[PDB]
Amino acid sequence: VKTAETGYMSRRLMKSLEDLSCQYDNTVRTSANGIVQFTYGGDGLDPLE
Amino acid sequence: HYAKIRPWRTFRLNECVCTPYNADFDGDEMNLHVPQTEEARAEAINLMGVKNNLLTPKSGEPIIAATQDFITGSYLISHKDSFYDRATLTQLLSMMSDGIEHFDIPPPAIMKPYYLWTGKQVFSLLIKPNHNSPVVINLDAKNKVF
Amino acid sequence: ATLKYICAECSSKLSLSRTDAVRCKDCGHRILLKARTKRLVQFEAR
Amino acid sequence: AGQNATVAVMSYSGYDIEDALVLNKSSIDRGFGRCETRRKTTTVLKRYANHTQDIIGGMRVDENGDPIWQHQSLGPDGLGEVGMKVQSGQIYINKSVPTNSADAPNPNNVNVQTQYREAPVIYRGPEPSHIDQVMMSVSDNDQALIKVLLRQNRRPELGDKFSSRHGQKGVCGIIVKQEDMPFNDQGIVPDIIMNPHGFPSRMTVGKMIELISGKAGVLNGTLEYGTCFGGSKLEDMSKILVDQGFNYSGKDMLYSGITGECLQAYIFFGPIYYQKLKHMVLDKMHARARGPRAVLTRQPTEGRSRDGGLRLGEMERDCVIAYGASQLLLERLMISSDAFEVDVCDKCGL
Amino acid sequence: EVAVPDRVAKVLTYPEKVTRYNRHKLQELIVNGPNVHPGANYLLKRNE
Amino acid sequence: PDREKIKLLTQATSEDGTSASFQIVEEDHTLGNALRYVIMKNPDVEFCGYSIPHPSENLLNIRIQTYGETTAVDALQKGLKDLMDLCDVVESKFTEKIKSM
Amino acid sequence: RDYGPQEAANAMNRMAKLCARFLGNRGFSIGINDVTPADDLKQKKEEL
Amino acid sequence: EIALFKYRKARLEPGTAIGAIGAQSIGEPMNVT
Amino acid sequence: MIVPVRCFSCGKVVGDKWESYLNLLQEDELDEGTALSRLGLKRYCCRRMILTHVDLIEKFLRYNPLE
Amino acid sequence: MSNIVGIEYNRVTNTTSTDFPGFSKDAENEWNVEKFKKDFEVNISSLDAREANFDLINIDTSIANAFRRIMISEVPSVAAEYVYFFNNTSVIQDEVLAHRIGLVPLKVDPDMLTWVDSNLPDDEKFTDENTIVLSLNVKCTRNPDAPKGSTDPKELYNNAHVYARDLKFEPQGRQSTTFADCPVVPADPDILLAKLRPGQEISLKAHCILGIGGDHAKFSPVSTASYRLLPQINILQPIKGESARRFQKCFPPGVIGIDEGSDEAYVKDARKDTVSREVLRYEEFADKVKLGRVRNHFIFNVESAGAMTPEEIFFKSVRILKNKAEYLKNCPITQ
Ligand SMILES: [Zn+2]
Ligand SMILES: [Zn+2]
Ligand SMILES: [Zn+2]
């Protein structure tokens, strides 16, 4: 029963967060070129590597 | 993936990559997409390919590795109890790479009442097969049931 | 025999005229199969 | 429903892993797990208000006494015939509709009611097949009816779901030959060979008893029972084996077919009943180059049957965004699906 | 890699623009024809 | 003699005997698991082992990496010529006992 | 993390082509006696 | 060398879409809830 | 359907002995395990198919054309 | 290690051949011959026509296992392959039934044929000595003699059970006089190819070619060819008394046996035993008995499909592997 809810969870969790890009200032910004954050997580370091 | 053509009919991936897909085998189905335009290819294998995406996005944690048979089989070679011999070892250190490679056999673990090579070696050479393979590691860890 | 096809229950050799009837000449029973073709056919056992 | 397969439990190959079985050539070829399949194609013949009957006439046969290969497989009647191999694009029943069928019947005719549009049903499939039996009959309302049924016997090809009837659900891996895989002393070769890992994580020991009960059965020559809260008490099974030479528990030695030296650990095998399932692969494999498109959206149609094409869902589509690929989308949701040139007008855009 | 069955390799094709490096493959790769695997099926001339 | 049975792999050889990798088309474990048993006991030979690249393809890769002194190919030549003599003996002693029975 | 992927995946390739071909040629299996309790854990099983 | 090299390499590489990876990251899979 | 003509593992021909089996059981009433043994199958995978394998072909011949 | 494999309760031990110069400090036991010839031996147990069981001593596992593999495949044989139906009405599939003839063995000696060639189709494929054609046709009619109703479905009918016996032989040019002394007969004559009831008839002639084992099991000349590795039971202490009597019931009957209560249980013989390792589960026997099998000594038994005498089978199986090795020698290494 619940996994059918989880899918909707991810899908909608995207739509607000869907386009958020890291520009070349290391300032992650919106579609409309607003600014949600200045550095990345106070860090600037990609969590992956 | 770089595609390779074989007979019968079914999509054969390498077991190590089952975990990202959480691929169970059993009866599950896949989808095979070729790209078309010349620049979508170089977009795929180079960026979206396996090797560079070997890790996971969220945890920066390896998501592709040995699972099931590969662990235990490796374990049974790693089992401190085990030993081997230059014929048996030689053939293992071969089988590990179907051919193709120049192996430099390190000194055997024990000498006298015959000769033997401990599993930690036949598995060690897996990492540094040649003397020219530019892989030098070092590390400590804890497996479970420590 | 060599002629065309068969009843179901009658199991009788029946040749039919072009657009004649779907009945079997002997029995009133209707459905009819088509008897085996005399022509050769090839399998490979393996 | 099933085959009763003499089956080791071992890791072999390296084509095994999760639930994936590994079968045996020279066994599968000896009549293990062979399938047939039967399909029916009904073609109803119906008269039209013009008083014109849809006719099965056929067999063109150009160039000196032989039908065109596209035709062939019929015989003089124009209907298909029994027992003859039919192959891909041929015609197993020739059918033609009248051309004027829907016109307004008038009390005016002399010569031609006879113009026919031949629209025979074509066989299409990845394999050959055979026409075993055809049926000409009449429906309840007195309109002609023709029904043929086609058959093919599928060899249990790589990629075919098997079960253990016990909850193990798996697909065969490499089909090894004969020589390979263990044998031991009798000379017998385990037929199915099965991955051990499945038992502990699925935690099902019922089967792993069923194997014992099996080997004990075939020795005494008796079907040996088992049942929910009951069945043959395991501890006597031992006694039946141990005097007849097989280990008091199901395990026994084996010799790896490859090397030919004793397997360094014991192995556990006996008869188990492996039933073979639907989801034969030769049905389910699917591919498309560029196929038909639905009139409305002009993007590929759905599923098997009709023709190819597959789904990229918004659940999936997002994936490539994370990787950051623009060009893969523009190839994907643009070039490869519906590529289209619209002529617009800069001024007052439409 | 993904091993792919040749029987979906016959019908699932990739476009190629033959230029200067590809000929002695491709001018050969046609002569195989679509039935045998290492070959081509559709062809499109520069004359559009 | 048809020139496709053995093909010396250009990629795994080094120089001056020592290493080499021969792929033997149209074969299986039936040969290798024997041939290596003769090879390994040749006094010089060090590393001799075989594998099948993939079963749906038919090839036998075999690897010979020896000391200095004699040569990669010379090893397999010799040892193979030895595996001859075994079977010659098995026939000799065998068909002799079966005749006397 | 050290040498970049092309070497990593190379290792794992060798892993696979080793553990696979070796594990059968040595062998491993389960059996009933392996799940069979022997004396002992019956005695502790009842009392505990 | 090693340390600060692994540092300078481990950084946002500009142009990556951190939003998408962000969502697909949280995606799977007395009394209080 | 019909008893197979070899087992699925050994390759000893079982096609023959099915007749001699059943005959040997009905006439000369004798227990299964002892029966098959002196019928000459020691290996058990050779043996199952005699023991196993209901014979359908009879139950399929009720439906023949002629009746 | 003294060519005696370890047997334990939870495992085996000491498997690998380990005869080769170069695993020791002092490298001996290096190849040559004579060191081999004057060592190696062979024995035999029994030879029947369609089966032989004999013994092969003091060679390693490998080349023996080669003989097993190559034997169960590479010694060629001849079995019906292509099948031509002249109609058929049988309730059995017009599909399957063909498969059946494909499998049934045949008593004919190979070397009387030559390999079919792939190319040159049709009339140039199957030629004279290249193929043994087999003919079968049977029709079933209601037996005019009908002793009683619903009795045994044999008396009721004619030939309702078709047997492999039914397959006849059709010779051709040069084909008659060459097999005149050795007419082909379908192996074990009595097999059920089909059951059918009157009004039903089967007419087929099937071409029979010379095939090779690994391609389909129906070409295996051998039903079962394998080798049991000789067990060695060896005891410590007299272990005499009453429980020594229990000791023999622990094994399969012949095995060891009691000489006298004081004379305990001597080992009567090995090779009757299945290596069933019960003495280990009984505990108290533990310290005083260990089990072993010797890698040198191969009990080796070979069935036959009836194709030819198994002495011939095992024999040719060698000269294959030999001939193969030499054919590899004389092919020069391309670069
Ligand atoms: Zn009738
Ligand atoms: Zn405008
Ligand atoms: Zn059997």
DSSP conformation letters of G1-48: --S-HHHHHHHHHHHHHHHHHHHHHH-----HHHH---STHHHHHHH-
Please state the length of chain F.
101
Following DSSP, what letter does each residue of D315-348 receive, concatenated?
HHHHHHHHHT-SHHHIIIIIISS--------STT
Taking the CA of residue J242 and the nearest CA in chain I, the distance in Å comes to 32
Instruction: Give chain B's largest Cα–Cα span.
Output: 65
Report d(CA F30, CA J214) in Å as an integer. Answer: 12
* Contact across the interface for J87 and C45, Cβ inside 8 Å: no
Q: How far apart (Å, rounded) are the C-alpha atoms in residues D295 and B80?
A: 68
Question: Structural domain of residue I62, as residue ranges?
Answer: 1-66
* D256, G24 Cβ separation under 8 angstroms: yes
Asked if H16's CB is within 8 angstroms of D321's CB, the reply is no
Rounded Cα gap, residues G23 and G18, in angstroms:
8
Closest CA to J104 of J164, J185, J165: J164
Residue type present at position D49: A
Chain B touching partners, 3 or more CB pairs below 8 A: A, D, E, F, G, H, J
Sign of CA dihedral B80, B86, B88, B90: positive
- Collapsing DSSP to helix, strand or coil, C11 comes out as coil
How many angstroms does the Cα of residue B126 sit away from the middle of ligand 2?
A: 69
Tell me chain F's radius of gyration from C-alpha atoms.
16
Measure the N-to-C terminal CA separation of chain C; round to a whole number of Å.
32
Give Cα separations from D165 to D168, D172, H23 (angstroms): 7, 16, 42
Other beta carbons within 10 angstroms of residue G8's beta carbon come to 17
| Statement to judge: residues J84 and J145 lie in one domain | yes
Give the burial string for G10-46 (b: 16+ CB within 10 Å, else e): bbbebbbbbbbbbbbbbbbbbbbbbeeeeeeeeeeee
**Subunits with 3+ C-beta pairs closer than 8 A to C:** D, I, J
CA J227 to chain centre: 10
Other C-beta atoms lying within 10 Å of the C-beta of residue J181 = 6
The torsion angle over the Cα atoms of residues F7, F8, F9 and F15, rounded to 10 degrees, is -170
Residue of G6, F49, F65, F40 lying closest to B103 (CA atoms): F65
Suggest the residue from D321, D327, D329 to mutate for an interface test with chain H (most H CBs closer than 10 A): D321
The residue with tokens 């109890």 is B81
Q: Cα-flanking dihedrals φ and ψ of residue I38, to 5°?
A: -70, -5
Task: Give the span between the Cα atoms of C34 and D235, in whole angstroms.
Answer: 59
Selection from J284, J288, J279, J270 nearest residue J4 by Cα: J270
Domain end, chosen from J217, J246, J266, is at J217
Beta bridge partners of D130: D85, D151
* Radius of gyration over every alpha carbon of chain J, rounded to an integer in angstroms: 27
Question: Domain coordinates of chain C in residue numbers?
Answer: 4-46
Q: Are strands D161-163 and D144-152 parallel, antiparallel or unpaired?
A: unpaired
The packing angle between helices F29-40 and J61-73, to 10°, is 160
- Nearest beta carbon to residue E6 from set B1, B5, B14: B5
How far away, in angstroms, is D344 Cα from ligand 2 center? Answer: 7
Backbone angles phi and psi of D131, in degrees to 5: -95, 105
D190 C-alpha to ligand 3 centroid (Å): 10
**C-beta neighbour count of F34 within 10 angstroms:** 26
In the numeric block, which tokens belong to residue B63? 């998501």
Query: Distance between CA atoms of B75 and I61, rounded to whole angstroms?
Result: 58
D198 near B26, Cβ under 8 Å? no
Query: At E27, which amino acid appears?
Result: Q
Q: What resolution in angstroms, rounded to 1 decimal?
A: 4.1
Q: B45: which DSSP letter?
A: I
Tokens 């499909």, residue located: J305
Select the residue from B5, B94, B95, B101 to test the F interface by mutation, using most F Cβ atoms within 10 A: B94
d(CA I53, CA D4): 9
D174 touches chain F (CB under 8 A): yes
Say how far apart CA B91 and CA G22 lie, in whole Å.
10
For residue J97, give the nearest of J189, J204, J198 by alpha carbon: J204
β-partners of residue F61 are F23, F51
List, in sequence order, every residue forming a beta bridge with F50; answer none if it has no partner.
Answer: F62
Phi, psi dihedral angles at C32 (to 5 degrees):
-145, 140
Q: Which chains does chain F touch, 3 or more C-beta pairs < 8 A?
A: B, D, J
8 Å CB contact between B25 and D20: yes
CA-based nearest distance B85→chain A, Å = 41
Yes or no: say if D9 and D194 are a contact pair by the CB < 8 Å rule: yes
Interface membership of B26 toward D (CB under 8 Å) = yes
Q: Are J72 and J225 in contact (CB under 8 A)?
A: yes
Please tell me if residue I67 touches chain C, with a CB cutoff of 8 Å: yes
Place of tokens 């854990």: G41
- Cβ distance J36 to F89 under 8 Å? yes
Q: Which amino acid is at F33?
A: N
User: How many whole angstroms from D210 Cα to the centroid of ligand 3?
Assistant: 20
CB neighbour burial string for B60-72, b if at least 16 within 10 angstroms, e if fewer? eeeebebebbbeb
Query: Does the annotation flag B81 for ligand binding?
Result: no
Phi-psi region of H23 (alpha: psi -120 to 50; beta: other; left: phi over 0): alpha
Which among F90, C16, I26 has a CA at the least distance from the CA of J316?
F90
Residues J291 and J176 in one domain: no
Beta strands D52-53 and D85-87 are unpaired
- C7 and C14 Cβ atoms separated by less than 8 Å: yes
| Cα distance between residue I19 and residue J162, in whole Å | 12
Q: How far apart are the first and last CA of chain F?
A: 40
Per the structure, the count of domains in chain I is 1
Residue with tokens 């003859």, as numbered in its chain: D84
Show residues of chain H in contact with A22, CB under 8 Å.
Answer: 12-18
Nearest to D271 by CA among D317, D201, D213: D213
Boundary-marking domain end, from J184, J217, J250: J217
C-beta separation of D81 from D74 below 8 A = yes
- Decide if H12 contacts A45 (C-beta within 8 A): yes
Could you give the C-alpha distances from J173 to D189, F51, J178, in angstroms and in order?
A: 43, 48, 10
Q: A44: exposed, middle or buried (C-beta count within 10 Å: 0-12, 13-18, 19+)? A: middle
The amino acid at residue I61 is L
Angle at which helix G5-26 crosses helix B69-78, to 10 degrees, equals 80
State the number of CA atoms in the 13 A half-sphere of J106 facing the CB: 30
Residue D168 token pair: 């193990």
Name the experimental technique: cryo-EM
Q: Closest Cα partner for D210 from D273, D275, D276? A: D273
The Cα–Cα gap between D140 and D143 comes to 8
User: In this structure, are J208 and J83 located in the same domain?
Assistant: yes
Say if the Cβ atoms of I15 and J200 lie within 8 Å. Answer: no
Does residue J242 belong to any structural domain of this protein?
yes
Which residues of D does the annotation mark as catalytic?
19
Q: What is the sign of the dihedral through the CA atoms of D124, D125, D127 and D132?
A: negative
The two tokens of residue D91 are 């015609």
Using alpha carbons only, give the angle C5, C8, C14 rounded to the nearest 5 degrees. Answer: 30
Q: For residue J105, give the CATH number of its domain.
A: 2.170.120.12
Give the 3-state secondary structure of residue D312: coil
CA-based nearest residue in chain I for residue D5: I8
Cα–Cα distance, D57 to C19 (Å, whole number) = 11
Helices (H), chain B: 38-43, 69-78, 86-95, 119-127
Ligand nearest to the CA of D343: 2
What architecture is domain C4-46?
Single Sheet (2.20)
3-state SS, residue E29: helix
DSSP tag of J219: G
Are D247 and J277 spatial neighbours (Cβ–Cβ below 8 Å)? Answer: yes
C-alpha count within 13 angstroms, C-beta hemisphere, residue J43: 8
- DSSP 8-state assignment for residue D70: T
- How buried is B27 (Cβ within 10 angstroms: 0-12 exposed, 13-18 middle, 19+ buried)? middle
Q: What is the CA radius of gyration of chain C?
A: 14
CA distance to partner chain I, nearest, from residue D214 (Å):
10
User: What token pair was written down for I66?
Assistant: 């002629």
Residue I14: CATH number of its domain: 1.10.10.60
- Of the ligands numbered here, which is closest to the C-alpha atom of C24? 1
Both tokens assigned to I19: 């007749």
**Is residue J16 included in any domain, yes or no?**
no
Chain D nearest CA to A11, separation (Å):
6
Q: For D312-316, which contacts have Cβ atoms below 8 Å and span 24 or more sequence positions?
A: D314/A11, D315/A7, D315/A10, D315/A11
Domain count, chain J: 2
Looking at residue H17, the DSSP 8-state letter turns out to be B
Give the DSSP H or E segment for B114: strand B114-116
Strand partners, J42: J56
| Residue J32 to residue F86: CA distance in whole angstroms | 10
Both structure tokens of B97: 């790479």
Count the residues in chain E: 48
Task: Please give the DSSP secondary-structure letter assigned to residue C4.
Answer: S
H or E element that contains D231: strand D230-231
Give the SS3 label for residue D59. coil
Q: Which of A3, A21, A45 sits opposite H11 (nearest CB)?
A: A45
| Single-letter amino acid code for the residue at D9 | V
Q: Which residue is it, tokens 């193979």?
A: F80
Decide if B33 and D310 are in contact by the 8 Å CB cutoff: yes
How far apart, in whole angstroms, are the C-alpha atoms of residue D29 and residue C46? 7
* Nearest-CB residue to D196 (from G17, G28, G36): G28
Rounded Cα distance, G12 and B70, in Å? 10
Cβ pair F68, F18 in contact under 8 A: yes
Whether residue I10 is annotated as binding a ligand: the answer is yes
Radius of gyration for the alpha carbons in chain H, expressed in angstroms and rounded = 17
Q: Would you say how long chain I is, in residues?
A: 67
Residues D281/D35, Cβ–Cβ less than 8 Å: no
The secondary structure of B62-84 as a DSSP string is ------THHHHHHHHHH-TT---
According to CATH, the topology of domain F1-101 is Gyrase A; domain 2 (3.30.1360)
Can you read off the two tokens belonging to residue J263? 């004379």
Report angle CA I52, I56, I61 to the nearest 5 degrees. 160
C-alpha distances (whole Å) from J160 to each of J87, J91, J137, J169 are 18, 12, 12, 21
Question: Contact, D189 vs D24, CB < 8 A?
Answer: yes
Radius of gyration of chain I measured on its C-alpha atoms? 13
Q: How many residues does chain C have?
A: 46
**Which residues make beta-bridge pairs with J231?**
J293
The DSSP secondary structure of J87-115, one letter per residue, reads ----SS-TTHHHHHHHHS--B--TTSS-P
CA proximity to D323, closest of B40, G4, A29: B40
- J25, closest residue in chain B (CA to CA): B112
Structure tokens at J178: 């060459």
Residue B132 in contact with partner chain D when CB distance is under 8 A:
no
End-to-end alpha carbon distance in chain A? 36
Contacts of E37 (CB under 8 A, 6+ apart): B5, E6, E9, E10
Those residues with Cβ within 8 angstroms of residue I1's Cβ, 6 or more apart along the chain or in another chain: I55, I56, I57, I60, J92, J96
Contacts of D89 (CB under 8 A, 6+ apart): D70, D122, D123, D124
Cα gap D46→D10, rounded to integer Å: 61
Angle between helices F29-40 and J310-329 (to 10 degrees): 70
Cis peptide preceding H29, ω within 30 of 0 = yes
User: Considering only CB atoms, which chain C residues are within 8 Å of D52?
Assistant: none
Give me B30's structure tokens. 């896949």
Structural domain including J101 reads 77-217
Is the Cβ–Cβ distance between D129 and D151 less than 8 Å? yes
Tally of CA atoms within 13 A in the half-sphere of B70 that contains its CB: 20
Distance, in Å, from the CA atom of F14 to the CA atom of I54, rounded to the nearest integer, reads 64
Structural contact between residues C34 and D79, judged by C-beta atoms closer than 8 angstroms: yes
Give the Cα-Cα-Cα angle J175, J180, J186 (nearest 5 degrees). 85
> How far is Cα F29 from Cα B74, in angstroms, rounded to an integer?
23
d(CA J44, CA J56) in angstroms, rounded, equals 8
DSSP codes joined into one string, B1-40: --EEEESSSS-B--GGGGTTTT---TT---------SHHH
Q: What is the largest CA-CA distance in chain G?
A: 58
Residue B74 to residue B72: CA distance in whole angstroms: 5
Output phi, psi for J291, to 5 deg: -115, 150
User: Would you say how long chain J is, in residues?
Assistant: 335
- Shortest distance, CA D190 to any CA of chain I (angstroms): 7
